Structure 1
């Protein structure tokens, strides 16, 4: 009966830990995908500044 308790607890434990790792791993990956997207959008805004600057330095 001590083994049955142990094995029941080990299944709950491994399920709890396996899930917590996935949600943490998934949060990082999704955020990192969103961060890379904004950075690419943010570097086209910086490019537009260089373009508008270049029109003012044309006259």
Structure 2
């Protein structure tokens, strides 16, 4: 009977810990995924703008050519 008593309470301990663990990991995954995503978006908007800058340089070179 005493062992089972020690088993129950250790089970409840391990239950709580496991929850805290899973919680911590999940939050860490979602923070990094979001962070990557957001930076990607920003990096693509910047690259589009840079490609528009190059087109303007080329338009300026086309006029100079004539």
TM-score range, shorter chain: over 0.9
Gaps of 5+ in 1: none
Gaps of 5+ in 2: 1-8
**Alpha carbon RMSD of aligned pairs, Å?**
0.4
Q: TM-score, normalised by structure 1?
A: 0.96
Aligned pair count?
Answer: 58
Tell me which structure has the larger Cα radius of gyration: 2
Residue 12 of structure 1 corresponds to which residue in structure 2?
20
Q: 1:5-58 CA deviation, whole Å, 9 max, x = no partner?
A: 100000000000000000000000000000110010010000001000011100
Q: TM-score, normalised by structure 2?
A: 0.86
